[PDB]
Amino acid sequence: PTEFLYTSKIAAISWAATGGRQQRVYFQDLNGKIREAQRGGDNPWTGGSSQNVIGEAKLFSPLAAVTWKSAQGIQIRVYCVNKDNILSEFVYDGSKWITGQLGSVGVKVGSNSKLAALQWGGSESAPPNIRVYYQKSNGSGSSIHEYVWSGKWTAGASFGSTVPGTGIGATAIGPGRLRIYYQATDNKIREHCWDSNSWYVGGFSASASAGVSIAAISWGSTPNIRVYWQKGREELYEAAYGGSWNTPGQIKDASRPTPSLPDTFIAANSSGNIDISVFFQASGVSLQQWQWISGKGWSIGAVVPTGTPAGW
Amino acid sequence: PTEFLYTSKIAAISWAATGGRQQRVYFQDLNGKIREAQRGGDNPWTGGSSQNVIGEAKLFSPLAAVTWKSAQGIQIRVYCVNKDNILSEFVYDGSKWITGQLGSVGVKVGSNSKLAALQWGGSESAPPNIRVYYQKSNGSGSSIHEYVWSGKWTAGASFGSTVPGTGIGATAIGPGRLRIYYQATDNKIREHCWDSNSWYVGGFSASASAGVSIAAISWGSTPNIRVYWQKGREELYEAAYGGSWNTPGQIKDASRPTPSLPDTFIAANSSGNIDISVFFQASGVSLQQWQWISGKGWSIGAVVPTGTPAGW
Ligand SMILES: C[C@@H]1O[C@@H](O)[C@@H](O)[C@H](O)[C@@H]1O
Ligand SMILES: C[C@@H]1O[C@@H](O)[C@@H](O)[C@H](O)[C@@H]1O
Ligand SMILES: C[C@@H]1O[C@H](O)[C@@H](O)[C@H](O)[C@@H]1O
């Protein structure tokens, strides 16, 4: 066995770095602690142990993460909720892990809410623009809320009517161009857009099993968007936009059918042009990933270490 | 969600009492603590909360339990292993929970070993005869070992060649008549017997999926024996002896197929003539039970409470 909490949420990020793609994955352990696992290039994963704790949150807390490069180094922000359901934030300032200011704002989240976050603009010469999405109530037909950081935290918009505790996918397809994916009350995955001056319902739409976990990534000038969703113990689905949307298809391995455990979640990251990883929770309890090798295809990759309890 | 540890082992006992059947179930929480849930007659289950901790063991520790009535009241013994894989025992002396003497004997157990225990003779006027079964190594072809309590703890016999960390079912079909069920290296469930003066291979045999969890109960003058086994996410199997063995059959509900989660365990209890409960771990993560109503049949019964973490 491992110390990976069953039905723990997952958050993942990655950036291209000289010497290879850098990846960081965040997950919760049996104690409610949020751990980090790291990967550089194709070398095996590291971390994921009790020495890799970056913070603590309520058990089964939702998770989201963003990153960008600044003058002080690599910036990372991890969002979660505490035992009182207060949206909280952990900060990696380029050299160490500390607690962010978001917690002091006192944003209350629905107990069964998921989280999603996106960022754009952040660089060595510019400040980041962060958006965090969450829900206030667990009831059916609830909307999605947004908190904005542009110098200080402030409430943003609210939109959509979703299934209870819907999965949420969020990606910045361009500077100031946002796309949010969630599951509507009719079980169809919908899209909300912000291109410059206002929010509006996007054209994307797809049928999915109730309660799927959702993730989204994007890159390029077109731009290209990939939306992923998965119901535990079912196969992973991918919708791809490359100027227009294709027909969603399954990503699977004939020799390893429905590898994820029931009621679990996924997370996806991307960097460069183009590397993609989709994480899921499997028997073990293990943290695994689907990896994309442009041109070739999808294959299940290396297992991420998630600790070993005492006595094993 | 709940505080029930995913893939936690389960132990269950029951006895007939004036005013209704009494049941106690033991399971592990996210912190490694062993909790107790109780049931009297047909009233809903109680306990299972952080206030119902009877002890602590390593995470994913195997469990076994026995009970009998004495002059000081209801006696219960719960077996588990600590973080150093030392077989340990919790004692309910009729009024309170304390630690047993078995731990001081220093019996080392294989990290992936399961546990089984049986008892006979214990009453208000006689001392009990307890037997605990376990394994020393996790390798294929390993044997089963026994520890004996008849005034003091001492090593017992060793027998069989099993699959790694085999499930173990043990029941006293009569005073001094023991039956142990385990899975042999060929995946067939086998039986070992002790009727009076020596151990010997029993006649029972059945094919099963590799790594099934096994439980066994017995009662009556015939006597009657029921052997249960289950692989997580598959259906429960039952072999019934009523003078001779029938053909193993599945116990299932057409409207709730394979209700257990993958890689989970079961436990069974019985009392009177005749009440039977088979516990399993389902989505939730919940502790559920199949209940037998003589003549009628099997049906999934009430859910056992296993706590609610803070923030939910
Ligand atoms: C980039 C594109 O922007 C709008 O046209 C949406 O309706 C599309 O679904 C896509 O998100
Ligand atoms: C009570 C019976 O005892 C022996 O005859 C075994 O071979 C049978 O399988 C059964 O356990
Ligand atoms: C960007 C930083 O990289 C380092 O290697 C890690 O140890 C830190 O936790 C953080 O992820």
Ligand SMILES: C[C@@H]1O[C@H](O)[C@@H](O)[C@H](O)[C@@H]1O
């Ligand atoms: C971008 C800002 O960085 C700061 O360190 C944090 O404290 C704020 O909450 C926000 O994340």
Ligand SMILES: C[C@@H]1O[C@H](O)[C@@H](O)[C@H](O)[C@@H]1O
């Ligand atoms: C026999 C005893 O019954 C009581 O009700 C319980 O509270 C104890 O834990 C024990 O099971």
Ligand SMILES: C[C@@H]1O[C@H](O)[C@@H](O)[C@H](O)[C@@H]1O
């Ligand atoms: C029957 C005996 O009861 C005692 O209280 C325990 O300490 C022994 O280990 C054993 O279980």
